[PDB]
């Protein structure tokens, strides 16, 4: 199920998407193609709720974390119970 | 270094510093600079929003508790200017642009009227004939019956009461500049809690009746005596002039003769010419008896007066309240009051919170009591004035509820401490608000479907043709049974279980039909199925009010959906369209529902009153006797279906406001469209959502930039919470707008 | 539907939902699906949907009873 | 993943804790060190004591786990950056969750496979037309 | 005289919403890539300023109501 | 010759007539109902007696929608005219936007005041390109 | 090709700045995807709801501006 | 009541024709092969026609309303 979170690259490395993302569904991961020599990455997203904060996070111009809401599972809906 | 005084601080609890704030005009021509995030510049309009939403949060702008003290105090003190220059304004239309005087020569034949509308584009209609060649709007406030009360004769007078209100307004407004500026008290003043509140029960409340009931003995009283007497308001000597003349007061009360000895000697007795308890109203004018009213405030004044001792301030006797409130826990709460103490003497929100609930409860108080027990002369003739005060006392009262509701929310937010709330009662709350919450929603479903659920089955019956099966007084009868007897009892108290009260406290509970002139002042409020009924809507439209207000305050923190909620503010749209959609899970949000059931809820009150009054109270009385009321009774089987109320209320008593062009009610036809109008524009905030306006202001600052009129503070569209903010409070304006004109127009029309 | 969003629904819903789970008796009965409040596009197409068949149901009711009771 | 530790914290109970969930399909653990006996505000409502050394506490969902993290990481003096974050499923098995490779996500971390990336921009997706008939959307592709 | 153009500016605002939500539902500047979320989708989140009402199924059903409000008129 | 033969002049309509010995006094002036049954019986009426204007474009009804359009347009247009100047000088100012919220009383007051000659000025920046600009140095949305 | 104060026009069909104009603030060096800085005077969308303003720079690839 | 039905039936069917108008341009919308014809031409100046719209909307409300408030007042 869960939502799908893609990361383009227009990714500058900032981090700010991990940090606001309440669920842990982003990691910074190595890369080559800003200065800040990461990318984002989102290896968990069967966590991930769709909440939109690291979107809102995301300096670029339109962002280049996105998500894409999807099939909902208990996990993506937030649910307790 | 502004005007510096001596010092003032009477070896006392005062300390105060000398120039914190310097005065200067800069900062006016700087908007924004009370907020850091807007002293930069204007990028976009919503900063332009902003600065009118975050004025007062002087949370938001300062961390100092003091420095938000400070301007606390000194914008109560500019508060209070503003209401003293409207009290003086009020005054001074009284004075030069009302027909108090004639009104007061004939106050049957004739009607209140202040305000003189200017002759122009035709809108001289508005200036109605109200009475002795008088042409003006007729007002409903009913200040003329307050000032009879009082003892006014002259229209001097007014003036030089609303030239005292000038100068009372300007007082305040110096003492907060002189506060905030010049000697501005510190925190550890604002915390005397004891002494603030053995003040305000003493000085405040008691010495304000004891000076009120001073001048009701030595001025009301005596004027009002000739005036029910007749001796017209040209032949009553001026007030001073029975201080200057102690026979005068003792030819109208022979207690005057005996001098200050039966009260230094404790023989109140013979002070029975003015200091009574009889109970009922007026003979002649309808009102309450004002030597009632006169003992009333001095028993008021007695009360509070000792109920100013007993906190402890400087001299060792009195009460600690943080002592009294640790005192109290139990088996069930755990440490009961221990923190409550701290955080309502930290906390502004808190105060706040319980403040307008407080208020709220006693102005809807006020209401329900000034309307049964009418305490001023002819007020009860006009049924305009009544059903207006009436209203305007439960909106107040609403409003100032709703309010408690948000500030409660706001300090769960801000000025919530886990450290200082450990095992105590907001603690074990919180650690059961599931409970409370599930358990209220259960109370509002039970009392939504067995409310209104019984007048669609009267509905339905009745459509079927089958009125043996309604609920009704003849039919299944739904009879206020505890009410009943709790009437009986009132009815029963003078003579019996209240002595030495001459008559009842309100003859709406029962006994002789007290008319004034042509109309009823007063008579029995008889109670049955259709009573009932509203009674327990009523009753829903309160739980459901609070169901959603507690909710909100209970869940500010965090819920099972958003877990983090306390970190993202008291005011914010939602966290994402995840999680299913988390749309108004905020405590603002809450407010913002509230607002809306509390505006369904007083409209229900407010119709309830409007229609019961003119069914079974309000009408004409006959040199026989026989009572022809305003809409020949309909309450109890018209009032038990929605159609009975949509035709019989609604449709029947609207003849007035849509009738009313070419005549001098038309302004009030005109707000009631324009109440309808504002009502329907509020949908489209309140349906709709922010992106299709940004998206369409794109395409609309497009062809601005295809012209180059592009302006450089980009044009953005309202915010999530702005939207609703809007919605809310257009919705709220055109309904209570709707109704205004309903009410004054159906009022005014019926003589 | 329209006025009132989501997220209040869900909170509500969660504390019915817990109120269920504790009541003895009732416990002997467990819902099949997890109840949740309407979907923000749902809740939209719902409320749409009884704002439409109100209006047309008011003025039907009224045009019909109207033109019939007067004939004309 | 084996056995967990540590100390339940010292509270009185919530209506706002574990419902059937817990016990029928899943449920989450967060397990932290404390220098002292220290006041922490509950995901669920409520004030509780954590013990000094190790805590155990078992939650309904994995966000209010990570939402007392952030807690412990952020409000408190000496802070606490040593949670541990797991799931736990009604069969007995614990899987370690959080944080992945013993690193904070915030920060980089050698050893870590990049998911979810796309070597393009935003702008550079196909068309719907393109994939219509297919089941995928154009960041699918 | 009025009511028809009360009928003008009724089927030109209804046109007005519907052809606004067509010819933005591929992309706008709050959403460049909307034509990735389908006709009909709750948002896009309360970033980048809020995002309430955005996919052109919330242009269709705003339009609803002006549409009802025409026929009513 | 019979035009508009559902109409009739209003000093020939009984209906006007009867209503306007009774018409409502405007002002403090006890004469402005006189007046209106004065100014008004020169335009078309109808049955009920309230008179109907005519926007047709004929000259014989110049009054009732011609001049008033031209005044309108002409208002509008300094306005307009006016405003935008004021925000074309301000945005090369360094800081235009405190600028838009904190107005530079002089500079309007010198812009409102060059407002009368709106109309040349507009022709003047058509001819050039200060009016409307290239549609490819103008931002748009994804197409 | 691109300079410090450089005025050019933004072609990314996505960008906000799409048809607008902005000035190079930086060109970072080689090995990057998109190295050119580019200042806007205008703020775009970014922000949470009821934010004030928005950010004014981005990163480019050179062939994505055109020189003014 | 016929006249009634058949309106709002019309009213129905322009809103879902340009319901589906939007689907296209979601769903099926081709820009390669309708390059430059009057379908793309129609969305390369959308701002223009939403902008005119808005103008032409606003002309007819504000007018509308206030020659009816004005007869009304
Ligand atoms: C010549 C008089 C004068 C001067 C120049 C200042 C100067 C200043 N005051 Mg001060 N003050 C004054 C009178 C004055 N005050 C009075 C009479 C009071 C009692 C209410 C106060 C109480 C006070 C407080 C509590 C605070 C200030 C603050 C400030 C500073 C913020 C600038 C500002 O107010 O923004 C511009 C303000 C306006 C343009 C006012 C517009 C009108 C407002 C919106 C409502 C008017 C209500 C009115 C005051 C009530 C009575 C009116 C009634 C008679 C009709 C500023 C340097 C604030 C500060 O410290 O800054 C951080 C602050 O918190 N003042
Ligand atoms: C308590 C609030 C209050 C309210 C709401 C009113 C309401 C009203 N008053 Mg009153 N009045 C008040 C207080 C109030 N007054 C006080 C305190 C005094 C004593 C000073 C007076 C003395 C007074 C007089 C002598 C008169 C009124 C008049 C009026 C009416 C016309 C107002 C007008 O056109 O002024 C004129 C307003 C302007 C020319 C524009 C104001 C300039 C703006 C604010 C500048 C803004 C741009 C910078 C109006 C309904 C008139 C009336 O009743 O007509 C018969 C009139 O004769 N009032
Ligand atoms: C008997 C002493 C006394 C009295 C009369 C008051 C009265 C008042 N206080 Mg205060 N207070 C006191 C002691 C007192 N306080 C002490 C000791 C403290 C320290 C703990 C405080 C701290 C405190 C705070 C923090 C605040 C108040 C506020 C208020 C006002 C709010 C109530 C109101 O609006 O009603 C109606 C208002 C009126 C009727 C106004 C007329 C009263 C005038 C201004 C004073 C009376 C004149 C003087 C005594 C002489 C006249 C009487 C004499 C001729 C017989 C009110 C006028 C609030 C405020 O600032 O309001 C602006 C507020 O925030 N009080
Ligand atoms: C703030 C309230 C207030 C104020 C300012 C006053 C003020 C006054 N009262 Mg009053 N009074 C009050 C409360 C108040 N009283 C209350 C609560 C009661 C009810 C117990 C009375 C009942 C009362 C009586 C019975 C008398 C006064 C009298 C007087 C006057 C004293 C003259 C005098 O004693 O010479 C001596 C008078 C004679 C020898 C005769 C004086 C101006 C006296 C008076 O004549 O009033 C003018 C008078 O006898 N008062
Ligand atoms: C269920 C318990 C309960 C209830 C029913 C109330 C209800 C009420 N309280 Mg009270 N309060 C409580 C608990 C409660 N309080 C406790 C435990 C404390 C001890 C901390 C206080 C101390 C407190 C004070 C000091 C005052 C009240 C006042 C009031 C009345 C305000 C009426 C009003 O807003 O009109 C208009 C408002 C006024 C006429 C006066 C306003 C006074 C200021 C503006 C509010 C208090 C300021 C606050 C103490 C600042 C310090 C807090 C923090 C910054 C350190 C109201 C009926 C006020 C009052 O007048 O009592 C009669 C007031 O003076 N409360
Ligand atoms: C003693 C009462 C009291 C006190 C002092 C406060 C104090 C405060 N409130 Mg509160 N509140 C109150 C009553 C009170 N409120 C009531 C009665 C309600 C129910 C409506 C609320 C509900 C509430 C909410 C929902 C919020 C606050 C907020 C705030 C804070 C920001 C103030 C503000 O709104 O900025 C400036 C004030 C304005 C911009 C008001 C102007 C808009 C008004 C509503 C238009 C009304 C129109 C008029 C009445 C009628 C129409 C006429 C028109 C055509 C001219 C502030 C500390 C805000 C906050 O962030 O809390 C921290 C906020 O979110 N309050
Ligand atoms: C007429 C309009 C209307 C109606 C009927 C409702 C209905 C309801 N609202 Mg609501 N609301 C409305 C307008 C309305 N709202 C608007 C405009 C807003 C925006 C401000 C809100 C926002 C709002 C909030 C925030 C909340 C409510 C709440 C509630 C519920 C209260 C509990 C109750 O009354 O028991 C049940 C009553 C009913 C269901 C009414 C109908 C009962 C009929 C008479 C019986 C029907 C017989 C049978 C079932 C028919 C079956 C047909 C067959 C073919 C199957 C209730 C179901 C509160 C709540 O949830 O309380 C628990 C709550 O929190 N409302
Ligand atoms: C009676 C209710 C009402 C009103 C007045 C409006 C008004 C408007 N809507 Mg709207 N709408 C409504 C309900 C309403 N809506 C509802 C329930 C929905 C479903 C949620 C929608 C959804 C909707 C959408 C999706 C759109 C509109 C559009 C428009 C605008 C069309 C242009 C026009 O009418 O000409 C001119 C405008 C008017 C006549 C209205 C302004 C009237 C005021 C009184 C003029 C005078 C200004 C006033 C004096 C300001 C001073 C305030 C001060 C006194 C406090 C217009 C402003 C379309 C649009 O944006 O047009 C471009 C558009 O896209 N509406
Ligand atoms: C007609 C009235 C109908 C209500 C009668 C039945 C009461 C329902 C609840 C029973 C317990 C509450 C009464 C004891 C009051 C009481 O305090 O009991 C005692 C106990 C706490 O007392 P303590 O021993 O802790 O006292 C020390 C205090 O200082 C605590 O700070 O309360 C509780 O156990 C918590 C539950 C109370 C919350 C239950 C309220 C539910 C809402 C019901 C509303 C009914 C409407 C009433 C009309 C006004
Ligand atoms: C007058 C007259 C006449 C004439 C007529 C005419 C000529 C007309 C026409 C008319 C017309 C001409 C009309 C129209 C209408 C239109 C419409 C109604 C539209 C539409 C559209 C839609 C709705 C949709 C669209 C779309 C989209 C959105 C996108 C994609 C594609 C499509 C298409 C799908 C005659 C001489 C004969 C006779 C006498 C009279
Ligand atoms: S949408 Fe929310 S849960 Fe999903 S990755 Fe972004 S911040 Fe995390
Ligand atoms: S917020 Fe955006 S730019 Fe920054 S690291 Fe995350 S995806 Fe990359
Ligand atoms: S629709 Fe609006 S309020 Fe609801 S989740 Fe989306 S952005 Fe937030
Ligand atoms: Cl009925």
Known sequence: ?81 | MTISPPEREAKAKVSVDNNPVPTSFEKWGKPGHFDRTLARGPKTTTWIWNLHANAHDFDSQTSDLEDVSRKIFSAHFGHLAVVFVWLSGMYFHGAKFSNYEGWLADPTHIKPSAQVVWPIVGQGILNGDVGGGFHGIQITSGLFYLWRASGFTDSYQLYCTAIGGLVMAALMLFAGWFHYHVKAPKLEWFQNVESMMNHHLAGLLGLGSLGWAGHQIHVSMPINKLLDAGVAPKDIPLPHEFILEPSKMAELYPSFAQGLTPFFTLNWGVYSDFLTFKGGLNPVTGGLWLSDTAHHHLAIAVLFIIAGHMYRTNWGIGHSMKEILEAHKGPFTGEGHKGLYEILTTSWHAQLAINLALLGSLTIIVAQHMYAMPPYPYQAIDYATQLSLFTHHMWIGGFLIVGAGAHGAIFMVRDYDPAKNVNNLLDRMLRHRDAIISHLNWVCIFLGFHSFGLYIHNDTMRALGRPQDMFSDTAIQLQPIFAQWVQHLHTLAPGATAPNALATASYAFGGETIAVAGKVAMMPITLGTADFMVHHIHAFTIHVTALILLKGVLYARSSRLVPDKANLGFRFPCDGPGRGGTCQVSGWDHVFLGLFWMYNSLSIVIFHFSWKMQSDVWGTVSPDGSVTHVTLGNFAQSAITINGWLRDFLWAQAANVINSYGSALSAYGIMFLAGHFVFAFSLMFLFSGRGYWQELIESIVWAHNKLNVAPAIQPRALSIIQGRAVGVAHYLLGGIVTTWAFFLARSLSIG | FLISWRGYWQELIETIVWAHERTPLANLVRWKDKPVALSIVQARLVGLAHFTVGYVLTYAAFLIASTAGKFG | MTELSGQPPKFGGSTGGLLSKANREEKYAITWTSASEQVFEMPTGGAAIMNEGENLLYLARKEQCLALGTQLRTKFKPKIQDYKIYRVYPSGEVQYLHPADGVFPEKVNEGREAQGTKTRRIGQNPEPVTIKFSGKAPYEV | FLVHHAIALGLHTTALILIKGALDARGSKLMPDKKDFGYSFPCDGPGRGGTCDISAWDAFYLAMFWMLNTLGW | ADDFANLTPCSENPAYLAKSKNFLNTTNDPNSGKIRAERYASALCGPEGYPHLIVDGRFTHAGDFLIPSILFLYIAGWIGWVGRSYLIEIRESKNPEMQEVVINVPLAIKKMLGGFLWPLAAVGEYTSGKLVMKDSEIPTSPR | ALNRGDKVRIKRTESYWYGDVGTVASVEKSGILYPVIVRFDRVNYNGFSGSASGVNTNNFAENELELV | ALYTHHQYIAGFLMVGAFAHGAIFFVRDYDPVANKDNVLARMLEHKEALISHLSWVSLFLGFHTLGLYVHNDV
């Open chain 1, 1 to 81: 199920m869960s939502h799908s979170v893609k990361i383009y690259d227009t990714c500058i490395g900032c981090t700010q998407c991990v940090r606001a993302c309440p669920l842990d569904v982003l990691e910074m991961v190595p890369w080559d193609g800003c200065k800040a020599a990461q990318i984002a990455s989102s290896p968990r997203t069967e966590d991930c709720v769709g909440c939109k904060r690291c979107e809102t996070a995301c300096p670029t111009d339109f962002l280049s974390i996105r998500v894409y809401l999807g099939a909902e599972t208990t996990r993506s809906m937030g649910l307790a119970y």
